[PDB]
Amino acid sequence: ITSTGLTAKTGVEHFGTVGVAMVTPFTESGDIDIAAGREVAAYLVDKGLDSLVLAGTTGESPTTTAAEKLELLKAVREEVGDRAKLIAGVGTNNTRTSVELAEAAASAGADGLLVVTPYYSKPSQEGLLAHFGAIAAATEVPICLYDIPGRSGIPIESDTMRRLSELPTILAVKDAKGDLVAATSLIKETGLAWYSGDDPLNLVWLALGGSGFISVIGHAAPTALRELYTSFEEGDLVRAREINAKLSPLVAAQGRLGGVSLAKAALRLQGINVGDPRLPIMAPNEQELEALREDMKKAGVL
Amino acid sequence: ITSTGLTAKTGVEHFGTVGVAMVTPFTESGDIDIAAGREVAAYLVDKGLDSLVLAGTTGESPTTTAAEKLELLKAVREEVGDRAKLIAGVGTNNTRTSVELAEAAASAGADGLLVVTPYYSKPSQEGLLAHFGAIAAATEVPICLYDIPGRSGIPIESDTMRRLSELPTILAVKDAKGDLVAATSLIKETGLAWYSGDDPLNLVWLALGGSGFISVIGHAAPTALRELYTSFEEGDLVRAREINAKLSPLVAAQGRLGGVSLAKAALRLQGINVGDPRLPIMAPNEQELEALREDMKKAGVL
Amino acid sequence: ITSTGLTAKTGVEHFGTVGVAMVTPFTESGDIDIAAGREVAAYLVDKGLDSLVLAGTTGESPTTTAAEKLELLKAVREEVGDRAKLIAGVGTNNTRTSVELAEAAASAGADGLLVVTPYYSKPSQEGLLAHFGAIAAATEVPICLYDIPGRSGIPIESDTMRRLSELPTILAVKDAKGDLVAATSLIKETGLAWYSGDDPLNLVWLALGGSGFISVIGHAAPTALRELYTSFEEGDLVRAREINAKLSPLVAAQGRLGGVSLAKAALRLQGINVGDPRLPIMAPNEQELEALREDMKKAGVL
Amino acid sequence: ITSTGLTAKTGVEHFGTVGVAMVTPFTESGDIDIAAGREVAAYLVDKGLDSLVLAGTTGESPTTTAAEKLELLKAVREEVGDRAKLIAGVGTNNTRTSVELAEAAASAGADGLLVVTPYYSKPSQEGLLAHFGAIAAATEVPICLYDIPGRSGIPIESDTMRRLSELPTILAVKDAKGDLVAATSLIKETGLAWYSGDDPLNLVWLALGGSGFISVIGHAAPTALRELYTSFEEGDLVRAREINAKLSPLVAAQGRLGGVSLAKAALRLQGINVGDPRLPIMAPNEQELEALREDMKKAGVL
Known about the structure:
Four copies of one chain form a homotetramer. Chain A is an alpha/beta fold. The first copy, chain A, has one domain (1-302): TIM Barrel, CATH 3.20.20.70. The first copy, chain A, has 14 helices and eight strands. At the A-D interface, α5 and α6 of A face α5 and α6 of D. Chains A, B, C, D: The active site is at 146 (proton donor/acceptor), 174 (schiff-base intermediate with substrate). Chains A, B, C, D: This is 4-hydroxy-tetrahydrodipicolinate synthase. Chains A, B, C, D: InterPro entries: Aldolase_TIM, DapA, DapA-like, Schiff_base-form_aldolases_AS, Schiff_base-form_aldolases_CS. Chains A, B, C, D: Belongs to the DapA family.
């Protein structure tokens, strides 16, 4: 019994197909709100998401402590562990702490690990092989590399990606680089599952052989994103591009506000208060919230 | 009687679906070779192309005279006019000469006009509206805007594109900019037919609602490109991405050699001598030709 | 008898020290205005400029014919030939026409030749050596390479620059690339005279060993530019940076309007009407002219 | 009694004139080596440096603990506190920890604070005002903003810089952005002391009104850097550009190796072992060390 759709199925047994880098809810005073975290996770999954990245960029990994992370992880697992892949962001720009975070996540029962390219310090590609190498050797949990030079300062070059694909636990890439020329070949060569790490390219990556997405706007239009995926899967391409174009306003808003502020502001607008972000990240002001409502109504999610 | 496929059909009655910016063959001494031009055009069309851009970038518009252009145009029209859309490159960075070239092409019976964004001088967007405006008013021939900041120095901004889509003869865009965020919305808003102006994004543009391509590597793999299109059209997406990935080496070669040198060198390697380019453009040296043969054999076209 | 100042004197006997890429005056109907051209040249030189580039970017080389160029050149030579170096822009993206333009300029008595990197077509560096090579072999007139990837699409790489510095007539570079790392070494290695091709870096280039400038804003503040040079030359650095900062508003305006529109609009505002530019280039509208007056008054030149 | 040189003296009473972002020495096993830290600081200052940034990028702030930082700071202060300005890097991409680090540094007796633009998360400019605002309100220690979009992902926009210059403790900018157009005006407007944060622009910034540098290559050529400064100060510009060009190879090496690896590898080569960097940063391999020796000998420092 097997029914092959049009979408590559590579690594979906570890990272799912349609998911989001979930926000980390905070109370009015900036404290982590575990209850709202479990609420949001169940909400999103019930909406169609089958994967959740906890402690990712959108999850505000820079302003949360290691304990807060582990806490959210264990809490969400108890909530939606039986029906969604839970991916833990454990990469930092310090190999030692990256290792610590990965071991803690493994013991917590994480289905996968998101390891961003070390940011700010700009290590050499040789440094990347040593960094990722150490992390992959610390646990048996599947790893999804996170390529995003726009935030980290350096990219994971093609040759480097090919070497890393040789490690037994490195099985996927969240791609926020958008180098379609290089990726088109790597997807075929490395055997790595490629996930869209940039909402405007969700449909684009599926067409090139992607396995799914790890979205931001998915917080505001989870059902739509699932539909984008299924549409492509079933060959209803016209439907896919209509949905993709439909959600454009959310992309524009993300561009003006940033993933964190947008995700938290959009959920609140839909009646799900998950607090505000921690400094230096900020919630949208009155004028920005007005522009956001506009985009959300145009996107058909408000 | 109508059978809707998955590909947008916008403007294909003027610019076709699968075509290439055809090379302008030169004899050993640098003179235009009309006979080889007609030979190549018939060859490409018989291979599956239903559109040809004459005097485009790949056609070496910078080193050919206005007379040589008109000549190739009239010659190709006599050869494949009854079965392919002929698009004439007429844009320059001088509004007066751009107008002159467009009128000459109209009288020659061109099915469409390719008008690149003025290069080098970097006019303002207001200047673009006046430039394109004058050209569109000079003839009744459908116009395809050519957006490629990488060669011209400036892009056709979104607002500017929306204004231009109001002119009755402006019906399409060759996109070599790759701003998927902006284009996803423009395609739906302006009603303009969008054509892939960058081979690695051919499949990507179809997924976003594109109408076809105006390729470079199409010179070396015309049948494959047609298949890429038909595959998408029929819903065979797996086939589409396999073909796309298959042709990657050609893209790499274009990246190392440039469209002109690659197109002319590749045809020669397949037994179709169309000469060398005119300075400052140069044919690949011995070492480069070796790397090219490699890519062509990997791409399955040699 | 010799009094060494702080400024490098390399190649100033061919290209001068303080000059501008002069505009090409047009009458109300777009025709070349030779009289105003001679008027402006005498005006600028009397103001302190000792060099003039005719038919450069700012001189609207894309919209003027070869005859109009030769005409302006011969006219200005008759006007200020006995007291200013006249540099002729002869580079195009066609090696044949570039050669034609250089020979015509040589016969006209040009003191130097400005040869921009071929634009739009993006030739390989090998193509550049062949292109510049052919031009340098056609006449005995000193050549100043014009490096500006921002307009042409490609840069003159360092290794390429080193090879070209070996040709006996290649003696200078107008630098509009701003790669201070590479240039700092090339200036010392190649022995080429380096000229600032970007007003905000005029003072910066002198500090790194430059020989002078080929300005745009110099049209509006010729005396000031001369003073910037002399100040540095005499060691009055405080004065130099005060003048440099003082002229900043002009740079901002050039950034909003482009060199051509700015140069022609600024002269008109100072009582010297040199017409408007030719399409696609456009004069500033009413609102832009207001902002320009503001910048000019702040710069102290209105 | 006052003798004005050519260099701006703004804020040098808090941040000095010639200094480096000092490395954080580690023993063979990766542990902090306080003794070598004090040795290097005394060495550099005796060589001519009058300022030292501790826990900066080059000081490997990403892989060292808060305690290790405070420790190095207190240790260096005891060593060279009576003759050099000690600047503490305290900025992170978490406002709370940035505040914690700044208070700890204040109590330690820091002469100034270096606060980098929050990296990776890409906050809005409004977020920057709130971030820097909170930090500046926590202590009375002079603050030097660190603008470097190349590492952080976002820049400190001009308007944002103008607002921040209003806070009483914000008195300087380490500039690693290189936007000479914007800075030329900000230096005059904001009254902020500008420091070169990129070695190839050290001389460039002095010419534009800079107050000094916070170098990387200064580890390998401290006396030369001091001479670069004094030369400019005394009006010996020819000497200044000869020194600047002379040190170019070090810049090239920094470009290939990165500041940390270069600084530590270069010191070792000069007989001062400060260990290797912590992962993901890596020391140069055998081949790289050979190329480095070459550059150092050419730079005249080996």
